[PDB]
């Protein structure tokens, strides 16, 4: 129904996969 | 001390109803209500599985390296958008065996933060910086349905389906951590019991919702279709 | 008003840490007090403040303070011009932690 | 002296009765009676299943697809406007195998928020016109009976079937959350026990009107057309 | 305070005997005695099933759309007034199967607020605004027997069979809610126990009343009538 | 023995089928 | 009058009125 | 609005963003 | 008035929050908050097994030998960069019998601090260059996925995935050791129960994302090439 | 030839 | 033709 093309904006405060406060910068860069 | 309207619709009014339902309200306390609500929502979404927090999305397989999205918590039905086909999940060893030993069925596994597939799938999706362009999803486009981790409140005007469907749940699960912050045990136990009861009611509703339109009787399926 | 060294020796042990949560006074008349509270890990020192709250009569039924020092001290201030309140007695809510 | 009427049938009288059975007359408590009633109604309807809160609606199948209404809690018997042909629920892994390996029974599933019928049935909606004219149902229609969720009161004169059938139910279940707000345990226990007993009586009543008036023996013989 | 006569025959005297048997009588209390009696009668009729609250009536089938009357709570024997015939209730799926696959037996089900019948029944009844006119019930006239919801008291002179048969039941089941209105638990428990005992006695009487004129011994019924 | 031809006068204070305080007006109209 | 007899009387119902659908028909 | 209905809405996710590997690719 | 932020995401804010939930502001107690957090993190990671703390690394097999990394806690699926060929763990007494009495499955053991593969596989490491260039993975590679142990904070601004996912976990588990330092039993019990519940929720979450979305029937038929 | 049950 | 999962 949708695609995952948007940009990173937050971190996974709940969830064992994804980004963290020490890694979101890498996603954004 | 603070006031509040009948419906607890938003974060702004929930953080005040919390301090209301607990006379333990002051400077050193209200400032951490956000942390209590954070802990409560984390304790909730850690095991709560319901539709309103689901999310469907297309994937890009690239025959292997396909990666798990960040919001992945639990996978629902997985299929395509062409004539219909449901995948089944197996272990890494089964796929490693399929690779050498050898296309109606399609399997998949979870290698760390990837989703592996035995056949060389060539699913296509628009690249990242694409502007709009729904792209009219092409063929061989798998559609994944999973449970996504909801967002954390960051503005008083920020609302969520949980507030409009069951605010008492959040209120109790956060009064738990509040009465823990201060020294109190009876309130902790009572609020925990009430929150657990509400969550049990909600999950039981979800259960009675699925497969709830008729009975079932397996019609002795012995693969009538064998010729192919 | 000022009283220091509230060890609760008549209830529990002095050296034991005690989490202070509330003061439930029974006032009379109209007014607006300014409560202050604090403590210290010792018995000789005039403890340092930790918070301060205003107990306006007719609206509030208590004052909420958060301390866990073993030796509590509370102060009462009334700087209002249109206040003729009074204080008959208090009732402190507290728990007991540990020591050392 | 908050005075309520004998036939409790509205939201305002219910609010006044809640404030009466909890004699405390204070803004800190009265202003939250709406929140307590909200919690109570959200606790009841979340697992209550009875006829009066059901609803019938025609679907708008385009091509073996659909969309669930925003007021859907649980689905029961579905069929067409003609000949019956009750549908039976299945799972995705079967309604997707039928297409590969497949007088004509019907099956439907739930793909998140979409009913998916295998045979690719077609449905149509009736005549919409509001000019005091009948709906004129449409041919090739499909009927669905679900347990609709009721709307929030948000008004004094508003009412519901519960206020007329079991007002004590909502009264006790909201006094429960009230006596939870204020630290009153025995009251919580009493009100919860009473509400549970009332709900048990209601669900038992809904069971004694079911397919009861007949023997349970002589199992049916819906075998086939082949004798 | 108030007085009362030996027999509690009507609502007017019951609402006074309630205040008598409970010294907790005053302005703020007597005004709600009607509500307590309403709650008690609701708690009673919710599960009480006995003859005196039954009701027989003809129906209008119209081959399908036939609707359930408002006072429907539970259906007793259902039949016709011509040579006798008893219907049996089945599920929607059975009727949907009967429709296509295919008249001594006659079945029926409950589709929401309707009573469906597989055969195209043509039962006839006089229309709504008909004045009197018993109509001399025609043939194909089904007669339904069910349990109807009794009326709520609205006048002091209004009486009911429950008052003339068992007033202590209502008195106890309403003193329950009275002692709940005020703060009291021992009385609540005692009155609840006594009311439950009375209701158990009444339902046991109803049970011992049915099939209570002789023993039973199935005479090995193996459908002696097969020719037809 | 009787017919259900009389007019609506009250609501089902007990009973899961029929009318309600918010629907009796419709029956009467 | 009946003392405990259940057949000694029969309390009426709410009202012998049909549904809105029957009136519309 | 829905009262207890679960289909009456659907709360969004954290963010529809991929991993660093997809951006690198 | 030690004030912490809402999004607890660092070591300093966690320390301040620990000192806050234990209102005592004294050097005798504050100076040991680091030790309590150390004990807590050493209690959690010692038996916690989840994806985010996993790691992938290429081995450097010379001749049927290897060396375990210094950050090894538990190993899971291992394979090669091509064709898969998942390896399966065995014991010394079997991987030493294969050599005597021995299309080609693989086996590996653990001889103290050395992985020993029977077939004498060869592996190579990728291109090391740090000149902003890709690693250029190497042919004949072997991938290993293990649960790496995280490094100690030793800094305020430092963080970890736990601080974002479950900061309450570390908070309660360190307040446990704090209330052990000072003789407080009820607090120890409460904090331990809460931490245990949180860890149970986490491990249950890790289980409901496993190979669940499929029937458990129709046992697989990975028999052989001989039909 | 069967319709739905509209509201009163 | 499969690589490892590097850090972000």
Automatic annotation (TrEMBL), chain C:
It comes from the Viruses. This is Surface protein. It comes from Escherichia phage vB_EcoP_SU10. The lineage of its organism: Viruses, Duplodnaviria, Heunggongvirae, Uroviricota, Caudoviricetes. The chain holds residues 906 to 1005 of 1005 of the full protein.
Automatic annotation (TrEMBL), chains D, I:
It comes from the Viruses. This is Uncharacterized protein. InterPro entries: SU10_adaptor. Pfam families: SU10_adaptor. The lineage of its organism: Viruses, Duplodnaviria, Heunggongvirae, Uroviricota, Caudoviricetes.
UniProtKB/TrEMBL annotation, chains J, K:
This is Putative tail fiber. It comes from Escherichia phage vB_EcoP_SU10. The lineage of its organism: Viruses, Duplodnaviria, Heunggongvirae, Uroviricota, Caudoviricetes.
């Amino acid at each position: 129904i949708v695609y995952n093309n948007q940009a990173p904006d937050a971190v996974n405060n709940v969830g064992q996969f994804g980004a963290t406060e020490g890694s979101i910068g890498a996603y954004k860069q | 001390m603070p006031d509040v309207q009948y419906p607890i619709n938003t974060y702004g009014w929930l953080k005040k109803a919390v301090a209301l339902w607990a006379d333990r309200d002051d400077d050193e306390f209200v400032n951490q209500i956000p942390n209590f609500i954070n802990f409560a929502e984390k304790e909730i979404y850690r095991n709560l599985r319901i539709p309103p927090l689901e999310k469907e999305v297309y994937l890009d397989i690239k025959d292997g390296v396909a990666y798990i999205p960040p919001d992945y918590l639990e996978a629902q039905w997985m299929m395509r958008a062409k004539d219909g086909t449901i995948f089944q999940v197996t272990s890494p060893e089964e796929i490693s065996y399929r690779r050498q030993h050898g296309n109606q069925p399609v399997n998949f596994a979870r290698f760390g933060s990837r989703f592996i597939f035995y056949p060389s799938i060539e699913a296509d999706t628009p690249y990242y910086p694409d502007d709009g362009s729904p792209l009219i999803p092409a063929e061989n486009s798998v559609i994944l349905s999973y449970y996504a981790d909801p967002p954390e409140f960051h503005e008083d005007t920020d609302t969520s389906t949980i507030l409009t469907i069951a605010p008492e749940l959040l209120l109790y699960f956060t009064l738990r951590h509040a009465c823990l912050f201060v020294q109190d045990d009876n309130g902790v136990q009572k609020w925990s019991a009430l929150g657990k009861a509400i969550l049990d009611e909600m999950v039981e509703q979800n259960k009675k919702q699925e497969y709830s339109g008729s009975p079932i009787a397996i019609p002795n399926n012995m693969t009538r279709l064998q010729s192919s | 008003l000022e009283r220091t060294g509230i060890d609760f020796d008549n209830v529990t042990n002095e050296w034991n840490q005690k989490h202070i949560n509330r003061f439930r006074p029974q006032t009379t008349g109209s007014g607006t007090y300014i409560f202050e509270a604090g403590g210290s890990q010792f018995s000789n020192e005039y403890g340092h403040p930790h918070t301060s709250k205003t107990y306006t009569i007719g609206v509030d039924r208590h004052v909420s303070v958060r301390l866990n020092h073993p030796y509590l001290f509370y102060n009462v201030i009334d700087n209002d011009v249109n206040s003729n309140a009074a204080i008959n007695g208090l009732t402190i809510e507290f728990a007991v932690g540990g020591r050392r």
